[PDB]
Amino acid sequence: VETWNAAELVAKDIAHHLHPLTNLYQLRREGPLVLVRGEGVWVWDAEGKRYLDGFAGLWNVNIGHGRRELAEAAREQMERVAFVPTFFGLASPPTIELAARLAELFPGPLDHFQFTSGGAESNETAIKIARYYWWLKGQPERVKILSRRMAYHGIAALSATGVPAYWEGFGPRPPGFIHLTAPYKYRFGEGLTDEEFVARLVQELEETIEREGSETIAAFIGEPVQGAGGVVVPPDGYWPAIAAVLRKYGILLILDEVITGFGRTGTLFGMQQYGVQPDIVTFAKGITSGYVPLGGVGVSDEIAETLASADRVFMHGFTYSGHPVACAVALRNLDILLAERLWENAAASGAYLLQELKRLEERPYVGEVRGKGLMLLVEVVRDKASKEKFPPEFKLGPKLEAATRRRGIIVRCTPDGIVMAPPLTISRAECDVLIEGVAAALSDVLD
Amino acid sequence: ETWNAAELVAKDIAHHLHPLTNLYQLRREGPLVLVRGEGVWVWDAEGKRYLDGFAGLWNVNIGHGRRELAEAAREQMERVAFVPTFFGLASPPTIELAARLAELFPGPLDHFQFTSGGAESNETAIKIARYYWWLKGQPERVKILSRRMAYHGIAMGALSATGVPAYWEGFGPRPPGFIHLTAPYKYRFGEGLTDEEFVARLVQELEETIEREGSETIAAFIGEPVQGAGGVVVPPDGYWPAIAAVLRKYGILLILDEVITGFGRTGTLFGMQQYGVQPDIVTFAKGITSGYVPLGGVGVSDEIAETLASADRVFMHGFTYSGHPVACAVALRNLDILLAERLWENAAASGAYLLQELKRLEERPYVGEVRGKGLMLLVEVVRDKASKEKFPPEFKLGPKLEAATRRRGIIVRCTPDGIVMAPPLTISRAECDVLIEGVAAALSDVLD
Ligand SMILES: Cc1ncc(COP(=O)(O)O)c(CN)c1O
C-alpha cells in the first residue's frame, strides 16, 4: 500500500511546477490537487480522498485507469526496444502495424498516416500538409485556413483555434487563418429552425469564400463536435452542407477528431456520426487512452500520392513521431476498445447523462444542457431571459471547481459552466454519482 | 509478435507517411525496419545488426534495453497512467521531476513546465518570454533573435526560430517577429580569423542588429550551445560569454536550447556548464528519458516565474500531455542511471577519442573538416579541400552515404554535407572503433 507525503508534494509543486492552464497566483496560495492512483473512472489524491474522473483526464482516458494490459504492452516494447525513429526511412513494427490498422479503421481512402505526440502537433502537421500539397500542385498562394469561432486546435494550430483568451499576451500569430461563426444555436441561432440556421451558416461560408477567393484557401479545419470551445453540438445537416460547399470549391477538409475520435461520440469516429469524409483527419488522446502521448494525421490516397510524387525529402517531422512504445500501447488500447465496443456504452451512458442532466434546466441559473455521446456541458447563466453570464468578479469557474472537487468530482469548471467527458466505460451507477455531484456543487455555489 | 519482414515493408510503403524521408524513394526502396535494441546495437527485421551511431535522434543517451525504465513505466501505468497538470492538477512523478530538475539545473532555473517534445518546449519558451514582457507592460517586446543554421523544431514559432531554409520551403507563411543572425561557423564564415577576431565580428553584428531593430522590441534570443541539426557548429572560444553579456546589456532574455546538448552529451550534464552561461529560460527534450517515453520541458528563472505568478489570471497555455506521469517516472529512473553512471564523463572521453580518430579522415582529399563537441560529431564532405565546394545535388551524396553506411552495419545521419554521429553516452572503445571503421569504409565506398 503506497503512502504519500501530501504536504511535501504540495510544497515541491508550489516551489517548482509551472502548471499549464492554471491560475499560478491561485496555485501558490492554495496548492495543487495531487492525484496518485487510478482505477476505471476513479482516482485518489495524496490524502486518500476518492474522486470520479468526470473529465477522463483531458477527454482522453477512454478505456479507464488501471489497465494492466497497456502497462504490460509498454513494458514488453521497452524491453525489446524503446525508441526507433520514423525519420530517414526508418520504422518499427508497432508503428507500421498501427498505420495499417488505422487505415482499416478510418473509412475510405484515409490510408496514409504520420504520427505525432499530441493534438497540437497533429493539427500543425495537417495544416502544413495541406499548404505543402497545394504548393506541390503549383498553387503557392493557396495557404489560407478556414476555422471557426470557439474552435480549439492547439496552442502551438493556435491561429486555427477560435477562443481569443488563448491569444492574449503571447504576441503575433501565424497569418492565413479565417474565422467563421460556430454552429452554436443557443446564442447564434435564436428563433431559427435547424434548417434556417444551417442555411445562414452556409451563406456565411459562401460569402467568406467569395471575399477571400477560393483559390487562396487551402483547407477548412474543424471538430465534428467542438470540444474545448464549449461542447457545441452542430445542427442537423450542418456538416453535409458545409462539406458540399468545400468540395464545390475544391477546398480540403481537415476533420479534427482529437477529442471525438475513438468512441467518445457513440461511434468510433465523429465523421461516421455526421456522414462526412475528410481529406485529412487529426487524432490524439484516446488513441492510447492517455497512457502514452500519441497523436497522428491521416491523409487520403490522392494527397499521399501527390506528396510521394516529389523526388525530394519531406521537410517535416517531430522527433517522437511513431514512437514504438506509444504505438504498441495504442495497438493494445485499440484491442480493448474494439473488443468491448466502448462506443456503444458511450452512446448509452451519454444519452442517460444528457437526459438526467437536462433536468437541471428547471434551475434558474442553467441556460442550456447539451451533449453528444460522452461530451456534455451545463451552461450556467445569471439570467435565462437575457442569457447573460456571471461576471468575472463572481469567479464562477473557481467556485464551481472547488465545490465539485470537495464533493469528490473532477469536472472542467469554467466561467460558462461545467464540462464533462467521463471515460467510455462509465456505468449507470457511476453516471448517477456524477449527476448528483454536479447538481449538489451547482446548489452549493448558486443555491 | 507475429510480424514478417516482407509484410512489414509492404504495409509501411502502403500506409506510413514517414517524416524527414524521401517519400518517392521510400515507395521504390521501402523502409529499414528496426525491431530490437541493446546498448548501442539495433537489429533490423531480417536479423542484421547495426551500431546506433545516431542514438535514434540524438536521444538514446543511456542506450537501449534498460529494464529499469521499462519497470518504472509499467509500475506508473498500473498505478495511474495519465494525470493532467492542467487546472492545478499534478501527479507525484511530475512534482518530483520538477524539484530534481530545479536541483540539477544551475542557479535560479527552478520552475518547470513539461511538454512532449523539443518543438513544444521551444514554442512554450517563446510564448513565455513574450507573455513575460506583456505582463511587464511592454507588449511591443515580441521579436525573437535566432541564427542561421539553428534548428529549434518545425512547428509553430519554433519553425520560425529555425534557421535552415529547407524546412521553410513549401509550407506557407510563418509567424512574424523572428530575426536571424549569422551562425558562428568558422570553417566557412571565419576564414583567416582567430577565434577572438571571429567573436568580435559576431558581437558587432549582434549589437548593430539590436540597434537597428530596437532593443525595446526584442523579447529574447534563442540558441543551442552547439548547433546540432544545422551541422554540428561548435562555437569559437569565448563566443557565449560575449553574446550573453550583450544580451544582458540590453535586458534581452536568453533562451538556451538544450534539447540535444542536455543530459550529458557534451561531456557535462548540460551545455550551459561547458560554455559558462546562465540562461533565463532553458528548453530540454530527448535525453531526459533517453527516448524511452516522449518528454520535454521548459525551465525558467525565479524572476520570470514570479512575474508569471503575480497575475491573478489563468495562464492560457499548455499541451495536453504536459507532465505525463509515466514520462516523468521514466525520466526519474533515467536520471538515476545517468547520474549514477556519470555518463557525461564517458561522453567526454569517448567523444575525444572519436574526434581524434575521425580527424585522421582529414587526410582524405574529400574531407573538408571533422568537428565535434562531446558525443556530437560531424565529418563535412567536400569535392576538394582547396575549393571547399559541396557536391552538387545530382550526385546524391546523402542517399549514397546512407546506403553505404547501412550496408556496413552502421546507422548515422547522412546529409549532402556529410556524416553526423550522435552515439549513446555509454559507447565503449571497441564500439567506437566499429563506428569509426564503418564510417571510413562507407566514405571509401562512395568516394574512393
Ligand atoms: C535543438 C532542437 N530543438 C528542438 C527540436 C525539435 O524537437 P521535436 O522534434 O521533439 O519537436 C530538435 C530536433 N532534433 C532539436 O535538435
Residue numbers in the entry:
A (entry chain A): 3 to 158, 161 to 451
B (entry chain B): 4 to 451
Task: Tell me what the authors wrote about this structure, in their words.
Transaminases reversibly catalyze the transfer reaction of an amino group from an amine donor to a carbonyl acceptor, mediated by pyridoxal 5′-phosphate (PLP) as a cofactor. Based on the sequence information of Vf-ωTA, a novel thermostable (S)-specific transaminase from Thermomicrobium roseum (Tr-ωTA) was also identified that exhibits diverse substrate specificity and thermostability. Herein, we report the crystal structure of Tr-ωTA at 1.8 Å resolution to clarify the substrate recognition mechanism of (S)-enantioselective Tr-ωTA. The overall structure constitutes a homodimer, with each subunit comprising a large and a small domain.
The structure of Tr-ωTA was determined in the PMP-bound form at 1.8 Å resolution. In the crystal structure of Tr-ωTA, the cofactor molecule did not link to either the Lys289 residue or a possible substrate, suggesting that the cofactor was PMP. In our structure, PMP was observed only in subunit B. This finding raised the possibility that conformational differences might exist between the two subunits of Tr-ωTA. As a result, although the PMP molecules were discriminatorily distributed between the subunits in the crystal, this did not cause any structural differences in the dimer form. As PMP is present only in subunit B in the crystal structure, our crystal therefore likely constituted a mixture of the apo and holo forms of Tr-ωTA. Specifically, the oxygen atoms in the phosphate group of PMP are coordinated to adjacent water molecules and residues such as Gly121, Ala122, and Thr323. The nitrogen atom on the PMP ring forms a hydrogen bond with Asp260. Notably, Thr323 and Tyr324 from the other subunit contribute to the stabilization of the PMP position. For Tr-ωTA, Y154 along with L23 and F89 from the other subunit constitute the P-pocket components, whereas W61 and I263 are involved in the formation of the O-pocket. In contrast, the loop covering the active site of Tr-ωTA exhibited high B-factor values, suggesting that this loop likely manifests intrinsic flexibility.
